[PDB]
Design a protein around this ligand. Structure first.
Ligand SMILES: Cc1cc2nc3c(=O)[nH]c(=O)nc-3n(C[C@H](O)[C@H](O)[C@H](O)COP(=O)(O)OP(=O)(O)OC[C@H]3O[C@@H](n4cnc5c(N)ncnc54)[C@H](O)[C@@H]3O)c2cc1C
Ligand SMILES: *N(O)c1cc(C(F)(F)F)cc2c1sc(C(=O)NCc1cccnc1)[n+]2[O-]
Length: 427
């Protein structure tokens, strides 16, 4: 163990905790079982690759278990479509291993550098949520080290389904995931057929997302403008598509379908708008995973607003543009059907990712966004959150009492605690 000053991805809210780095799973149990012997506050929390901007992976004055050295891939089956990996396997290595099997990772996020454990405990969502769902929708099994010292096999529709769905999106507060079984998406190739569209306004962006085009694509997301004033506010470059098949690939890349090949004055004028429009408009473009998907002093803010709340979603975008806080990196998506995890972030609706530069009055401004998001029936993402209040969060997640009841039953001693847990009063 080493006392380290660790952080979320946001470089924010430093906390000092004793970190454990061991590949011995049995060793991991000893420390957890030792903490219950200490029978006191400052519990233990698991940690993946620290890609969450929040304080969900730190436990100040407590214990942190870095799960990254448990990166053994046990089995991959192309017939069953099942992989079996330890919770410290990252999604980049898992993808690499599975492509030769004709398999694809069911849910991939913006970054590839996330653990299986991290992917489950934040129930990560991706460019394909509307066609595939969250990461938890694909976990066919997982083994969880609970507070009692026991390791419990968990299943989605099994007898222990309650504790399963509480661990899905449960920010590691149910226990430490050790090993999981994930059903993969079958794939003919490692390429994408891509379809591109450019919009001129927020209305035209929303129109395209509710006209029915979404049905044609399994993957969908868009870069959007949040600086320009109406009507240009909300204009977007949309990138949509699906996993390609061999026959769809050009013959020169038919060789190895499952290969992962390694990587003015007009601009603002009417011709610039026209040039950008045609260059952003394309049909059936064959692309790499890099080309399609993965092309400190900031604060990333992510919220979703229920689908039917179209106008109140348009209102909050107008607010952000009006506030004088300028965000350039903006991701727009329309989530499909939510799952049955109480603490799951995604619900069907209008997902926004904004990235604000830290400056005077931002903390207070985003507290006013928290207010509107909550008011318009939406929620925030624990993975992105470092500074919302417990009260605001509890109201955003109506099933929070349902989740806490599970966590109280499985971990009454409060063996598993984190900075977030205390902040959002989930213990
Ligand atoms: C550039 C970038 C882009 C991103 N894009 C997306 C995106 O498109 N969609 C999206 O949903 N998210 C996105 N994220 C956030 C990230 O995908 C999630 O926060 C992810 O869960 C973090 O994985 P991690 O391995 O870093 O885990 P950490 O950040 O280290 O931990 C995350 C949480 O999971 C718990 N946990 C981790 N491992 C285990 C385990 N073995 N057992 C029990 N609990 C565990 C921890 O306790 C902690 O609460 C992005 C992050 C970055 C930096
Ligand atoms: N929001 O956090 C978010 C949401 C989504 C999706 F809509 F697909 F769910 C995708 C997404 C983000 S943030 C993100 C990202 O990493 N963006 C910025 C970036 C900066 C530097 C280099 N590459 C990307 N992605 O993809």
């Amino acid at each position: 163990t080493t006392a380290t000053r660790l952080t979320g991805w946001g470089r924010t809210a430093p906390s000092v905790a004793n970190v454990l780095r061991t590949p011995d799973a049995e060793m991991i149990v000893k420390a957890v079982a030792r903490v219950a012997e200490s029978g006191g506050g400052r519990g233990a929390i698991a940690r993946g690759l620290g890609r969450s901007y929040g304080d969900n992976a730190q436990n100040g004055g407590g214990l942190v278990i870095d799960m990254t050295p448990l990166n053994t891939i046990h089995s991959i089956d192309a017939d069953t479509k099942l992989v079996d990996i330890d919770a410290g396997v990252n999604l980049d290595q898992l993808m690499k291993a599975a492509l030769p099997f004709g398999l694809w990772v069911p849910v991939l996020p913006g970054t590839r550098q996330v653990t299986v454990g991290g992917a489950i405990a934040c129930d990560i969502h991706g460019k394909n949520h509307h066609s595939a769902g969250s990461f938890g929708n694909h976990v066919r099994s997982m083994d969880l080290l609970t507070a009692d010292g026991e390791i419990r096999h968990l299943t989605p529709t099994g007898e222990d389904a309650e504790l399963f769905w509480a661990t899905v999106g449960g920010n590691g507060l149910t226990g430490i995931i050790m090993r999981a079984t994930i059903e993969m998406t079958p794939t003919s190739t490692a390429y994408f057929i891509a379809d591109g569209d450019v919009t001129a306004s927020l209305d035209e962006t929303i129109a395209l997302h509710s006209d029915g085009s979404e049905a044609r694509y399994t993957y969908s997301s868009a870069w959007f403008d949040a600086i320009s004033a109406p009507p240009k506010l909300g204009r977007a470059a949309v990138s949509r598509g699906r996993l390609a098949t061999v026959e769809q690939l050009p013959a020169k890349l038919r060789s190895e379908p499952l290969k992962f090949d390694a990587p003015n004055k007009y601009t603002f004028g009417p011709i610039g708008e026209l040039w950008y429009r045609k260059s952003g408009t394309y049909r059936g473009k064959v692309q790499n995973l890099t080309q399609f998907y993965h092309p400190a002093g900031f604060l990333q803010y992510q919220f979703v607003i229920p689908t039917e709340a179209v106008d109140e979603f348009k209102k909050i975008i107008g607010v952000i543009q009006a506030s004088g806080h300028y965000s350039f990196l903006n991701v727009f998506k329309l989530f499909g059907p939510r799952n049955q995890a109480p603490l799951s972030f995604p619900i069907p609706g209008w997902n926004i990712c904004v990235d604000f530069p830290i400056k005077d009055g931002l903390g207070k401004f985003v507290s006013e966004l928290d207010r509107r998001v909550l008011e318009f029936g939406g929620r925030l993402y624990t993975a992105k959150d470092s500074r919302t209040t417990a009260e605001t969060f509890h109201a955003m997640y109506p099933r929070v009492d349902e989740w806490i009841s599970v966590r109280r039953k499985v971990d009454p001693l409060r063996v598993f605690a984190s900075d977030m847990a205390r902040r959002l009063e989930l213990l």
